[model samples]
Target: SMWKEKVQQYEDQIINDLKGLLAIESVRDDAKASEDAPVGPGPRKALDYMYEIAHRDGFTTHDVDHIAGRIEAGKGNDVLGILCHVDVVPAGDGWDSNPFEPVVTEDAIIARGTLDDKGPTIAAYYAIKILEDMNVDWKKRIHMIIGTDEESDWKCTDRYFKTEEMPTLGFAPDAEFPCIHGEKGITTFDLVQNKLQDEPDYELITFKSGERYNMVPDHAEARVLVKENMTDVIQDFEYFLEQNHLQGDSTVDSGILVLTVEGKAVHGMDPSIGVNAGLYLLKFLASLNLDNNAQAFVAFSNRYLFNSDFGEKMGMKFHTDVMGDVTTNIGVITYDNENAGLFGINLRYPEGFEFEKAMDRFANEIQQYGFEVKLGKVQPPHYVDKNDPFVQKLVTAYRNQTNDMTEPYTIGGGTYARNLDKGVAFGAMFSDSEDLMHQKNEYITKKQLFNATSIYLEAIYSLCVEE
Candidate 1:
């Protein structure tokens, strides 16, 4: 009851702090990177802002090479980890307001990071602060580890956990609720097409799409140098748009026919939800007479990834009842005359799936089309038994708080929970909550924020303070 009262008292403060963090465009930027700002100035600023709050609250803080940091409170040899990220994915198109400016409506806080993480970060922080203010006798030290690059590669946690002490048990407050006991394995790889130097019948000068390997591309544009009979081709493009029920525009710049397509963006963990703009544009290109490299690239996409999110085309489709079916997202596509074209794909597979065999098969298949498979980052599936004590603690917390008869489950979205030997994802997202983590106009309801804070308060207390 005291914890709930404390959370209510600090509701405005927590919302204000969340707004401040969300205002910082903490998207990873390699161009503006330096030693002091490893991932980017935005992420570094956000990392420091969290430390600033911890210091103001008189808690000890540690900065891990500017890429990651931790705020520590309570005492004891054992540690309870609350893993969260400050860096967000790029604020892409289709937002009603300035994504970084955080629009606070009567019901919710709307911003790029509101639902994905910044809002949850504040909720967890206040949960710890509430216990600290109440002067509860903590039996274990609590570390709220802050990360800078969870959306892209996990350089933050990878670097932090390299030397820092690991928690006895931990949870990431970044995914759906009741609790998440399992997370599917995540792997990213690139399919590279050899350079096609010569211009041919229909020249594809340039093609580009997507921002990250974890998000669907909302926009795709291609510039192709087509010969005369341009009017017929433009009419065909218009017909294709109308037939496919897609939104796009075509323009002629000099002799190049520029085509652009718009699609919805969703997290790559589940590609079936959002339309893949890159693939749609390439499907249209499949009909057109094209050069050697363009034809090969389009054919490769159509055969393996286009119109199939379950990897049925790639021959890697597999599923388990616990974690669901394997899914794939063609997150990034690029092509140029001088350079090789590549498709950056993100794949999530279930517990019993064989990643090595699937990848080997993929490589062998792609080699037939003058393409090479280059692997990027890979993380194996993470799971904590549903009956595990740590998991039951979280499940109990959620059930007790909401009176909901839900059970722990698995998800495709990877979280920092995998970093811990014994960890699970708990709260921040509830059963009926809208899934808007990686979409535009993302927000977290005010009631949801306070309710999650209350839940986190109970969860944190049970894990860190109770003996």
Candidate 2:
């Protein structure tokens, strides 16, 4: 609790650092820079930003050979790590304030990264700064691994572990506090390529959905050039869209028709909650019985592991025990009438869930419909023993700091925590507060930021100082 006074002393500076980082659109989009850097320009720039911080602030640091960096304080072989990522999902439309611009809103730092890695990163960074300024009697080394590519393939951490030293025990302050003890496995599947050998009777302009894994695909669209004179089928497709409350409209450009569909967006980890516009389009296309383009789209999406077919014959579906049942999402969809179509699915599997088995089941089902399947980006879920000492210590840090009785738990999402031996995610996203991370108007309250800052300090001292 003594750190409270030190925290108060540097409150403004802490908030300022958070602001500086949040202002940059540090999303993986920064990779758009055509540079020959290890992690590319965007994350590399973000990577360099934190490096300069440690360099300028007098925190004994290492670049982790450029995968990640660390600010080392104190000395001991039994190290403790606090992990956070620099990459953010894109800022969606609809923000009252500039999504990247930091604003203090009603006891909250309203910004994209405020409740995400940015706020917590600054919080933990300063927490150690407090310890350093006070010259506290701590024996163990505390290294903060600021990662760069958490929103994509986790290459940032992949590079970190590949080139740098590992920590003895650690938890990333990027999820929930009271500490997360278990995390579900993350799996991805890319349905087979929809190849087109001949021109179709209709022009199926295109279909697209989602860009990242963690953030749910909020946007899906299909510009289909409809076929002529199939009255009954067109009526049925229209009826289906209306029944589901999904939006679809049509227009004719020089007598060439274009149809578009739109659905609500939610995180891929829990797909049923998110309205997948792509799925809606596929359902309508299936009803039309248009061609291979539509059939392939429908067939691939017709399963439990991928599309949601388990409910049809097996009468079995994803069920929950602790972290909840498997969540299936058809995140990204792409199509071109002249070429075969392709789809990407996001699955949040339970800790013990075997990814291959699910893929096999999905493959068998698609084959039943005369379709081939190909899977990619299978990120197996991450887990940590709830009873582990490291887990208990992080949990105790939260309980001691906030006095909340709720226990830590897991989910079917991936974070940088999976890169370490004894890793878990802790964070700025609290139970009651909401800051639509990838949604429009993404924001985090200042009060939550401060609370998160306090929790980070408490956990660091408990784990690193052995207090």
Candidate 3:
């Protein structure tokens, strides 16, 4: 492709720009900075950052609703879109460097959003830059759409689709490197029950967990004011947390002992990779026979599969199609003096599986336990045909670059690609590298960054260069 000549011309500059963008920490904002929107201003800043780059690159751009923006590189009715997000999950504890400050190691760039979106976004941006600088002509518009709130909610991209034009072909350069044709739909559920303070079994206490919904809670803690003579209870609590291999900085503060449990953080969709700190906290509390509510909640987490005793008892398991069996996660939990508690969970479902039907089965199972489940944030999954032009083109580009013949696969995690009918998740995670997107020291090898930029250039050229 003639675009290859141009891509080879500017690979270094593209990698540099990507590293710069990765240095910004665009975590979710829990404040009220937006006067009229649901999510706050972090996304707004991400939009401005991307738009600024596009403006500097001399592309025609549209700032859609101040939340999302699109860059157009061709003057035609057919548009091929590249979706990406600037918003990143919170840079949780234990990093060798500041999460926002990108550290380029010999092989990778260590930062929060390097492999999530910022890196890929910049790489794809420069891909277009290479083609434009080479005076390449295209039959369709090459649109780069950036979203601000993709860490948990996707208000930025959602608003763009409602108010902007849809593309004929699109792919988000945001996930696995080899490209994805199908993605499992993701759903979030709230398993909450009101716990009243008057329950006579134990002294009421307070607890908190999870700074964000998408992140598996890395830390969870609880405090209780027990009788001065209750040394046995205190020891039992310590043993309880230890038996589960949980570590926390528990101490006596203000005559109240607080126990904080720490677990490795991970994305909620892959709960198997993370030790659920919230569940650990609940598990310890439940063993003490705290109350009916505690029993119900713990049962939901540790039990309930085909009526089996493997502890899938509280009714939180379901099987799916080739997306495999739908799994569950109890991410965050908190209890206060009011005896009220809230817990968050995520479910990844296969295609053609009805979320409503799954919900019905889940509710029916939990109904036996006398607790009702409430629905929370829901993101319908994105699936693209394997034979679609864009999907095949992107997948082939990845295969050519990596020389890996593994079949294109589906994933549980959702990306901005779902917002576009023709878009699919193209790349960010390398098949050979460890998946480090949301984990602490989240990183992209500097060499890997360069390789990704090259791939983006090739893909853009393949998609945009006229025959």
The superposed Cα distance between candidate 1 and the true structure at residue 203, in angstroms, equals 0.9
Sort the candidates on TM-score, descending order.
1, 3, 2
**Cα-lDDT of candidate 2:** 0.67
Give the clash total for candidate 2.
19
TM-score of each: 0.97, 0.87, 0.90
- Decide which is better by TM-score, 2 or 3: 3
Which candidate gets the maximum TM-score versus the true structure? 1
Best by lDDT: 1
Cα deviation of 311 in candidate 3 (Å)?
Answer: 11
* Tens digits of lDDT, candidate 2, 407-460: 778855566677776788776667768745556566677667666677777777
- Of 1 and 3, the candidate ranking higher by lDDT: 1
Q: Model 1 has how many clashing residue pairs?
A: 0
In order, candidate lDDTs are 0.89, 0.67, 0.70
How would you encode candidate 1's per-residue C-alpha lDDT over 154-240 as one tens digit per residue? 889999999898988899999888799899999999998886446455878889988788999989999999865788778988998
